[PDB]
């Protein structure tokens, strides 16, 4: 068994021959008549092997008598039959051919050996004349074309010293003659004379190249082919049909056009033949060969008369139809059966139906063994017909087999795990299968015409999973996020909240009652109201005592529906639970509640009754719908009398030439809108509480039996949207362009609709639908490819020992918490003492596990941010620690080593991206205000005006959170400053659309400086008013004369001077950018807070995010801190001389200047912070800053598009996913290892492990890190198997090959691909054993 | 025992593990043919390892002893 | 005869489904009353009449 | 198709998500009960027997 | 319909889709990859060998449910000595680790 590693290198031509059992010469196949095989075809069955075993052709030894013998009769050896798998014959051909993917395969692998280009050898190949085969005198060089003409001159001046003719021979003998070895040692000897600069660095390539071939062991002469194997016949078979046709795989074809060529060149070479068909020929050998190995790649595709072109080898492990993504990772199962499907509403929550037909076929084996076992079918003859005949017995025998006896339940598309699950059999006689309604959601499945299917557990290992793993009583909480997957569906909820309802006017109000006992007497008898809030006594429990019930008995005026109801509850809770109208949020933490406290059994027995009880009653309940649940408003023919003579003014006013469309337009649809809002109140007013019903009194109105309102209220089905579309106008409606049509929606859907309307429908549907079915393949893209990275992590120390990692901070933004900090800091290890806002109140040594007790500690408190040790920051080598992954969530408890996961990310992130794509600061309440780093000024009026991009106003409350977050415009004009409290509801601020003020706090004379006509700017009247100046225009229509140049008119006092920004040295005059267009002319003056300038005016965003794409237009964050100056003056973007303070200015980077800048030309920035309005590379910042703050802005940026759409995951995902991106070590220095070579973090760990220590003090090299994406990791990997199984599989064989690599197969795809067991799972205590193993010698 | 499979877990602490030992214990009981230790009460063997697992009578400890004397006293019969 | 499920018409919109019924029930409403009139063999008079 | 009565009403998860409840009486009177012709068949051909 | 094992084909020699011809359903990455984020790698295996490729695999496995044993062993999948000779044909030096 065991391994560690082994060797590869090229195919000797020995190894073909040795491997092959004898040479194939013919194409020849099969007789015409007597189909049978053919001598020394490619069906050679002396060679490949006989049909039968251990028999001679004419059958005279036989059967192990004769071993090792070979009938001399027909020369046929007495041997067996599995190796006809194996046994190829080979081919040897007449001239030598290459192989084409150490070839036509990017950097070349023969080629890059060479360094000598391509399209020479090519033509060398092509034989354009003559060609240097081996230019003896270096005068002449090799792969060096001779013409017929030109060669007699390199003849008559050398004959003897070249060899300038044809063919791939001159490749052969290249490969041949170079010699690696004192070319490495001689660069390395003139390597330490002067290891110089780029010449080095190529010797260096060059050396350690030369040298991995040397000690890895290679044989480059075995690049090129002169044996050839043969497929065996049966992996490329040939056989008949029933009509006579027979059926082939295409590979037979090329087969025979390669041997067929090469017969006729074994007859040309032997005629001594005008070489020049022997050229053509060769070209046809080549071009076979290389078919053979790559067809349609080349040139136009080989075709038969289909006109279709021919699948190669290379599609048979590739793509689609390959093995790995077809039929090795996904296979076709025996013992399955699917149909459709419909409710159980009696089920228990283990059922499932079993149409006992389906029941006797999967399980046909069963009930023979027992129909044997009890012996009344002596013979499976027996059995068979007995069963054919369905004895009485089969059914009880079916039952008797079928009991304890689980299957598995399957519906498409399965998402994630729990579509998947396995219950116990309940069989019936009904054609449809039986599903118990709350797991309708799991598998997002509705009964309009499904299929579900199913599958059977034989071995007991299987059987046992399904019970303990699959089953559905140990699968009650997304693993995504720790909420219920046992949401009423629909309909118990609509009939509990029937139930526990509190009317007024039914009748039985105020009397008593010792209990629900005769509250249900009383109903079922027929004499209270259910909904009637009427005086009973209750006699709840609790565990106040340490788990020791407390009883209690009092009275509380409820409803005769929350009485009744409230005998379910399992007596260790209080009254107020129940003491409302039951909201489905209720319900959810009703049954965690129940969950949490009890253990689980009652919850469980609990839901059941529930389910029970609200279905019985809810069919007792009634509910139903009418005509007149919708409404017909008394006002109907006043509102249309009034949108009469509105339109009809619309109409007079187009009449006069004036509000000629736009404004008439807009107008039109805005009084509609208004007009059907107010029908829509009109009606849901002539509804809801209209009935007057009165009962001992004068009247009363009371909530009216609509059901409507009902059913919207629960959560069933439907909603205020919903209702008004009924109801009300149906908003406005966009047409396919994204623009928003201006005459809407009037009418509903009991009122009648218009055609177009209709039909302005259509189209929103439509489009919407398109994007339904047509991106299952962008989440199927996404998820598969993170999955195929999947490798795992375990645990190796109890506690690292270290310090510190990462901070909590919950993810509060934009509207409430969304992350309790009490849940992020739960199942952790704090980093250090953490304190509470009572300040050096410690409350940790150093490390805890902080289960709630400590996250409620700290709840109350109001402490707001506290460090964890991660395992990113557990420095435990190889693995981690296990308190900084903290809990295990399934146990509930620190975690415990081995398991591990991954495409549990994958489920939980992709599963719901299905469908989950279809100026101002305020204040809104009181308390303090935190904002900072952001340059602002108080603007001329006397408020807070923004002068620095960043900031983006929040709305926080009084204990400090955000309620809001909204963008903010540079240079806008609030009303608020910031660090003022407001009362909320305010436009705090009324800015100007299309202006963007140029305010000059400076009171100096104007002048045309900087600014000339035609050159930075135009000067171009502002033709409305009348009056102007020099008149900047945008970036692209000045021309370049001055569009290197800032335009900047100039502000002076009565001397010229700079008129200094007030309070400081530095002058003020704007560089007006485009629309800063100034209207007073030169020499004008201008005042304080004076406008020299007027300046008028997704999904694929997570492939963005994931794919680890650059962003893409606009200038960025300062790379490189020290002061920053500019560059090349705009060939289109200007650049950017960076000018650090010890670091190298050379860097300068294209910015739009048409997108305004931050960082003047003579300000410095600090790296990381912003040059310009728009983002920047996360590559800019792996390579700037650390990984947190990188690490840190990704899953900021991707969580926020997902809590955009109402999403949520438990984002460990999102950062071990991101662990999962790449680990390659750029090394820094050198003198251990290469200067920057990519390693393992691992090994350099160990080399710094070794090398560091005391050993030397240091001889090597330091490191980074880097990104540069999933896929490439995927493909850069130990293994070549996982990564040569997906697409582009063959560029990916190639380098394996080349290397001659021999995966160790440890991985998942790697032991997956082979089927033998992988570290965990089933195989965890195998791995495990091997481990102690390991450690115990 | 029948519906769940949480108190043999709260026993051993894994499904894995759990699910391991229930499939040793009934290839012991599928063909070996020998007796339970629970009552039977007309259950698969599924429900009895499962029960035998969870009283505190099986585990993969408990098998090793069992077979490995068994079989030492087997190669003391066969001398 | 049927009963169906009202859970969906809000969501599913089809009223014109609603009115089909309406129509439907008034038009045996005129069917029933001829069946009366045959069991009882209406003279020629009524029948044309009705 | 055919004509006949019809209640609107949920009903002890009969009418659960989409589905269809009914009488017994309307296939005593086959109504909706109806047919399919499918069809069989028996190629003779020669054989060398 | 809900049926049984069909045909196999030939060049790959892999078991049938449809019902009405005695079809499994086919499975993409995501339906195996469920299974590695569950932990039946027993069951994973089953479903890399036994079913569609392998023969020793299945044909061991049903010997044995017979027997009452339900054990497993595993061996290779016919479609990876098919990627070696396949890749070999190329002429790269590629083999078999056999056991
Ligand atoms: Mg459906
Ligand atoms: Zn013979
Ligand atoms: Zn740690």
Same mark, same amino acid.
Not at chain 1, 529 to 548: C, F, P, W
Not at chain 1, 715 to 724: E, F, K, L, N, P
Not at chain 1, 957 to 965: A, H, M, P, V
Not at chain 1, 1258 to 1267: F, I
């Given at each position: ?793 375990? /645990? ?47 409350? /940790? ?400 760990? /160990? ?44 560029? /990916? ?45 | ?79 | ?50 | ?49 | ?99």
């Amino acid at each position: 068994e065991e391994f560690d590693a082994i060797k590869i290198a090229l195919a000797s031509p020995d190894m073909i021959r040795s491997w092959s059992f004898g040479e194939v010469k013919k194409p020849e196949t099969i007789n015409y008549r007597t189909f049978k095989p053919e001598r020394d075809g490619l069906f050679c069955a002396r060679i490949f092997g006989p049909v039968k075993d251990y028999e001679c052709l004419c059958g005279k030894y036989k059967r192990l008598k004769h071993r090792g013998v070979i009938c001399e009769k027909c020369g046929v050896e007495v041997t067996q039959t599995k190796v006809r798998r194996e046994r190829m014959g080979h081919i040897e051909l007449a001239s030598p051919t290459a192989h084409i993917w150490f070839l036509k395969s990017l950097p070349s692998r023969i080629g890059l050996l060479l360094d000598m280009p391509l399209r020479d050898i090519e033509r060398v190949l092509y034989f354009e004349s003559y060609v240097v085969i081996e230019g003896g005198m270096t005068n002449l060089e090799r792969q060096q074309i001779l013409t017929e003409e030109q060669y007699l001159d390199a003849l008559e001046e050398f004959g003897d010293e070249f060899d300038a003719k044809m063919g791939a021979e001159a490749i052969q003998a290249l490969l041949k003659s170079m010699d690696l070895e004192q070319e490495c040692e001689q660069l390395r000897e003139e390597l330490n004379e002067t290891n110089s600069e780029t010449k080095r660095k190529k010797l260096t390539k060059r050396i350690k190249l030369l040298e991995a071939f040397v000690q890895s062991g290679n044989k480059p002469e075995w690049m090129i082919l002169t044996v050839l194997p043969v497929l065996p016949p049966d992996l490329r078979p040939l056989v008949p049909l029933d009509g006579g046709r027979f059926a082939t795989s295409d590979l037979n074809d090329l087969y025979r056009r390669v041997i067929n060529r090469n017969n006729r060149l074994k007859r040309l070479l032997d005629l001594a033949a005008p070489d020049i068909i022997v050229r053509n020929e060769k070209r046809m050998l080549q071009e076979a060969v290389d078919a053979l190995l790559d067809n349609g790649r080349r040139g136009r595709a080989i075709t038969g008369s289909n006109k279709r072109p021919l699948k190669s080898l290379a599609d048979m492990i590739k793509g689609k139809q390959g093995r790995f993504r077809q039929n090795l990772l996904g296979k076709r199962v025996d013992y399955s059966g699917r149909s459709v499907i419909t409710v159980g509403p009696y089920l228990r929550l283990h059922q499932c139906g079993l149409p006992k037909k389906m029941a006797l076929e999967l399980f046909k084996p069963f009930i023979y063994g027992k129909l044997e076992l009890r012996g009344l079918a002596t013979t499976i003859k027996a059995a068979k017909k007995m069963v054919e005949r369905e004895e009485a017995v089969v059914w009880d025998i079916l039952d008797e087999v079928i009991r304890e006896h689980p299957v598995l339940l399957n519906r498409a598309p399965t998402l994630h795990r729990l579509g998947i699950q396995a219950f116990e059999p309940v069989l019936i006689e009904g054609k449809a299968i039986q599903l118990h309604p709350l797991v309708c959601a799991a598998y997002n499945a509705d009964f309009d015409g499904d299929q579900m299917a199913v599958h059977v557990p034989l071995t007991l290992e299987a059987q046992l999973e399904a019970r303990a793993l699959m089953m559905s009583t140990n699968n009650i909480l997304s693993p995504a996020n720790g909420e219920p997957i046992i949401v009423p569906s629909q309909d118990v909820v609509l009939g509990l909240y029937y139930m526990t309802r509190d009317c007024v006017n039914a009748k039985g109000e105020g009397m008593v009652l010792t209990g629900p006992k005769e509250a249900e007497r009383l109903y079922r008898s027929g004499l209270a109201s259910l909904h009637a809030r009427v005086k009973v006594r209750i006699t709840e429990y609790e565990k106040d005592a340490n788990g020791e019930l407390v009883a209690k008995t009092s009275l509380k005026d409820t409803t005769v529906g929350r009485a009744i109801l409230w005998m379910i509850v399992p007596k260790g809770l209080p009254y107020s639970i129940v003491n409302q109208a039951l909201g489905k949020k209720a319900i959810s933490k009703m049954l965690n509640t129940c969950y949490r406290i009890l253990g689980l059994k009652p919850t469980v027995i609990f839901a059941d009754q529930i389910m029970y009880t609200g279905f019985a009653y809810a069919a007792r309940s009634g509910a139903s719908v009418g005509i007149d649940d919708m409404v017909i408003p008394e006002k109907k023919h006043e509102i249309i009398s009034e949108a009469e003579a509105e339109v009809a003014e619309i109409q007079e006013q187009f009449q006069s030439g004036l509000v000629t469309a736009g404004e008439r337009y807009n107008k039109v649809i805005d009084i509609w809108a208004a007009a059907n809002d107010r029908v829509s109140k009109a009606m849901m007013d002539n509804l809801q509480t209209e009935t007057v019903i009165n009962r001992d009194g004068q009247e009363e109105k009371q909530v009216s039996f609509n059901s409507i309102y009902m059913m919207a209220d629960s959560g069933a089905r439907g909603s205020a949207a919903q209702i008004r579309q009924l109801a009300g106008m149906r908003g406005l409606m966009a047409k396919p362009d994204g623009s928003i049509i201006e005459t809407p929606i009037t009418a509903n859907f009991r009122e009648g609709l218009n055609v177009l309307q209709y039909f302005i429908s259509t189209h929103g549907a439509r489009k919407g639908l398109a994007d339904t079915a047509l991106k299952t393949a962008n989440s199927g893209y996404l998820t598969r490819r993170l999955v195929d990275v999947a490798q795992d992590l375990v /645990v190796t120390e109890d506690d690292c020992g270290t310090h510190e990692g990462i901070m909590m901070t919950p993810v509060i933004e934009g509207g409430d918490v969304k992350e309790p900090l009490r849940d992020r800091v739960l199942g952790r290890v704090t980093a250090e003492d953490v304190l509470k806002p009572g300040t050096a109140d410690i409350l /940790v040594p150093r490390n805890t596990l902080l289960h709630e007790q400590w996250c409620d500690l700290l709840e109350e408190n109001s402490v707001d941010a506290v460090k964890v040790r991660s395992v990113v920051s557990c420095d435990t080598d190889f693995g981690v620690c296990a308190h900084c992954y903290g809990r295990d969530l399934a146990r509930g408890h620190i975690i415990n080593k081995g398991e591990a996961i991954g495409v549990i990310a994958a489920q939980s992130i992709g599963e719901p991206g299905t469908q989950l794509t279809m100026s101002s600061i305020q204040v809104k309440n009181k308390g303090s205000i935190k904002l900072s780093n952001v340059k602002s000024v108080v603007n001329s009026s006397g408020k807070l005006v923004i002068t620095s991009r960043n900031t983006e106003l929040k709305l926080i409350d009084e204990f400090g959170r955000t309620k809001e977050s909204y963008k903010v415009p540079y240079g806008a004009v609030l009303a608020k400053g910031d660090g003022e409290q407001v009362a909320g509801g305010e436009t705090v601020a009324n800015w100007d659309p299309h202006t963007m003020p140029v305010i000059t706090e400076v009171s100096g004379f104007v002048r045309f400086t900087d600014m000339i006509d035609g050159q930075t700017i135009t000067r171009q009247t502002d033709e409305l008013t009348g009056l102007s100046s020099l008149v900047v225009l945008d970036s692209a229509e000045r021309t370049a004369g001055g569009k290197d140049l800032r335009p900047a008119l100039k502000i002076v006092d009565a001397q010229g001077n700079d008129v200094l920004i007030p309070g400081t040295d530095m002058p003020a005059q704007y560089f007006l950018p485009g629309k800063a267009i100034v209207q007073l002319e030169d020499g004008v003056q201008i005042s304080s807070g004076d406008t020299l300038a007027r300046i008028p005016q997704g999904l694929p965003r997570v492939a963005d995010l994931f794919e680890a794409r650059r962003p893409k237009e606009p200038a960025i964050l300062a790379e490189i801190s020290g002061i920053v100056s500019f560059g090349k003056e705009t060939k289109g973007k200007r650049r950017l001389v960076i000018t650090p303070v010890d670091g190298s200015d050379p860097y300068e980077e294209m910015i739009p200047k048409w997108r305004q800048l931050n960082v003047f030309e003579g300000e410095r920035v600090e790296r990381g912070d912003v040059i310009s309005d728009g983002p920047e590379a996360p590559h800019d910042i792996l390579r700037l800053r650390g990984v947190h703050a990188v690490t840190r802005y990704i899953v900021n940026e991707v969580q926020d598009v997902y809590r955009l759409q109402g999403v949520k995951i438990n984002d460990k995902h999102i950062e071990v996913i991101v662990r999962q991106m790449l680990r390659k070590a750029t090394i820094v220095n050198a003198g251990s290892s290469d200067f920057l070579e990519g390693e393992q973090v691992e090994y350099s760990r /160990v080399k710094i492990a070794n090398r560091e220590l005391e050993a030397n003090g240091k001889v090597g090299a330091t490191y980074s890190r880097d990104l540069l994406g999933i896929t490439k990791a995927s493909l850069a990997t130990e293994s070549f198997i996982s990564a040569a199984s997906f697409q582009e599989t063959t560029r /990916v064989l190639t380098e394996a090959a080349v290397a001659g690599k021999r995966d160790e197969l440890r991985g998942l795809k790697e032991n997956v691909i082979v089927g033998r067991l992988i570290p965990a799972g089933t195989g965890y205590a195998y791995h495990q054993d091997r481990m102690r193993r390991r450690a115990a010698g | 025992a029948r519906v769940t499979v949480q108190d043999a877990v709260e026993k051993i602490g894994n499904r894995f593990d759990l699910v391991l030992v229930a499939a040793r214990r009934a290839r012991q009981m599928q063909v070996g043919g020998k007796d339970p230790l629970v009552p039977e009460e007309n259950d698969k063997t599924t429900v009895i390892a499962l029960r035998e697992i969870e009283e505190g009578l099986i585990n993969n400890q408990i098998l090793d002893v069992r077979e490995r004397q068994e079989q030492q006293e087997q190669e003391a019969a066969e001398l | 005869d049927i009963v169906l499920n009202p859970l969906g018409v809000p969501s599913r919109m089809n009223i014109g489904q609603i009115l089909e019924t309406h129509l439907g029930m008034a038009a045996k409403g005129i069917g029933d009353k001829i069946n009366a009139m045959l069991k009882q063999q209406q003279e020629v008079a009524k029948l044309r009449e009705f | 198709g055919q004509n006949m009565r019809v209640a609107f009403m949920p009903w002890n998860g009969y009418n659960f998500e989409d589905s269809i409840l009914v009488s017994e009486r309307v296939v005593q009177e086959d109504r909706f009960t109806t047919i399919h012709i499918q069809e069989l068949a028996c190629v003779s051909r020669d054989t060398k027997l | 319909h809900a049926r049984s094992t069909g045909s196999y084909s030939l060049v790959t020699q892999q078991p049938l889709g449809g019902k009405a011809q005695f079809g499994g359903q086919r499975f993409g990455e995501m339906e195996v990859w469920a299974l590695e984020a569950y932990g039946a790698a027993y069951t994973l295996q089953e479903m890399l060998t036994v079913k569609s490729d392998d023969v020793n695999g299945r044909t061991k496995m049903y010997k044995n449910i017979v027997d009452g044993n339900h054990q497993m062993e595993p061996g290779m999948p016919e479609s990876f000595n098919v990627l070696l000779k396949e890749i070999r044909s190329l002429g790269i030096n590629i083999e078999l680790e056999d056991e």
